[PDB]
Swiss-Prot record, chain A:
Active site: 211
Clinical note on disease: Nephrotic syndrome 6: A form of nephrotic syndrome, a renal disease clinically characterized by severe proteinuria, resulting in complications such as hypoalbuminemia, hyperlipidemia and edema. Kidney biopsies show non-specific histologic changes such as focal segmental glomerulosclerosis and diffuse mesangial proliferation. Some affected individuals have an inherited steroid-resistant form and progress to end-stage renal failure.
Up-regulation conditions: By various differentiation-inducing agents.
Tissue-specific expression: Glomerulus of kidney. Also detected in brain, lung and placenta.
Top-level taxon in the UniProt lineage: Eukaryota
Domain Tyrosine-protein phosphatase: from-to ranges: 26-270
Compartments, record wording: Membrane
Record organism: Homo sapiens (Human)
Protein function: Possesses tyrosine phosphatase activity. Plays a role in regulating the glomerular pressure/filtration rate relationship through an effect on podocyte structure and function.
Name of the molecule in the record: Receptor-type tyrosine-protein phosphatase O
Similarity comment: Belongs to the protein-tyrosine phosphatase family. Receptor class 3 subfamily.
Amino acid sequence: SLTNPVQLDDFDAYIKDMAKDSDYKFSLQFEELKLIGLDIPHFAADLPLNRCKNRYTNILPYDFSRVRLVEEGADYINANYIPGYNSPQEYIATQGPLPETRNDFWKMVLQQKSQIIVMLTQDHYWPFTEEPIAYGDITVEMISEEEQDDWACRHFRINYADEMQDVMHFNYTAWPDHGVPTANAAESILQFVHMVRQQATKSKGPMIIHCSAGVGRTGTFIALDRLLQHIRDHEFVDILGLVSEMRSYRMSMVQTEEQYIFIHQCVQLMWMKKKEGHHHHH
Amino acid sequence: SLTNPVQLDDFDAYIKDMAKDSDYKFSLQFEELKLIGLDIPHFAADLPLNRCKNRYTNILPYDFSRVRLVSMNEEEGADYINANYIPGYNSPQEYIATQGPLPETRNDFWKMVLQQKSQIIVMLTQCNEKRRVKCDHYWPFTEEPIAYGDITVEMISEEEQDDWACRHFRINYADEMQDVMHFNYTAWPDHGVPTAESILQFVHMVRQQATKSKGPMIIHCSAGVGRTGTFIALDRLLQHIRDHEFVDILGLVSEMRSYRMSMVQTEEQYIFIHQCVQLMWMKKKEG
């Protein structure tokens, strides 16, 4: 429905055209993306008892792709499985946990067997000290912590009954809140993405990604992660088709035209890196 | 991973290159496609108690995309049926690909039809082919309402033609009633090809009805992967060619295989899909 594959050889001319007439086509395409999933049911998220489990009143997970926890509304959590470059349920896009949902969040991590969590914002649902904390029936203890300039990695040990699970936690902290992303901002985020991807290819369940609403930065991170891998193996990119797809699994993925344009900004840099690399295929 | 969009303007040149050296490139692509989905679990389909619900021991539904039957405190495994949600041109769960119902699962099938609220069923096989069993005649023989478990089905009409039959069913569970159109294509031999004009009109026919219907479109043949996979590809492609200037059959077939194994069973059916697009392209050029 919404898809526009562009040969990498034509991306430069493509983005320039997208930008003409005051970003007319960027805006038009974004206006079209806003129509995706309008008719997909999201009744569970609107049930009386689950309303308090949503950070934002109008950002609700579709019923078909929602992650279900295993009482009235006890299976609910604002999160959706999202397709990736490698599997149909490679990711779980979710909102930043609320104090009232942090126990449900850890239950999701355990049940879904997620060994990688990506936080795109700076709510502190994890332990502050080395002391193991019990979030409901699940005990979580931070094993180690590494801190870089733009991100931090934490290793968590989660247990329940006889079950034990190791979970890596990547928190990007240099995400720009205001102004247009500088060439450095783009570079940093692309490095972070690449970094998480190296760990991904070595993990169990779906990769959990979140930002306050779980759609903007989250959908942007997912798009970039999938794009880097795609651009490495292919000679074309279909950004429109990609964001449209995410919109069909979780509403508002890539929340703003700003983020939509930014994604194109990053792909141009990816294309520049691919060309300058001249790497043969493995 | 597996994807290769081709502008329609050079699809002819593409097809001819793929057909070169006795379909060398076509086979190359099909072998790659046979690897898709091998790592996706299908634990529920493996349960001993569900073995009698699988027509074939090797055609099994993935856990993540399988269709779940709903019931109140019912027996273990009661939620199981050999079927999977498949993305379509319009929505994430537009189709439900399933095997041809067995005598032991005909009630489960109708339960799925009612619960999923499907108003269209596409059957691409005959119940029997070459004296070999392919699918149970799970629907009524006459106009007399038949009870399948707690669901009653009434065949309001039955219009047959050379290559297909259209049957209007009215089904109900107490006061929950539903109209279901059943399109049975009878000229598609299992593991083979219609042997394009005929099947394309069929697809167009089902498409017309679809625009008037709501709910998932149930698609099945015998195993629920070969002809079913080819039909879905065709249905989706017809709509895609109408709106765009390119096609990615490789990515399309790869995607289906990530939702249900073996979609589009043979290289021949895979090549048939390309041939059909070529025909679809020319029809579009007549405007």
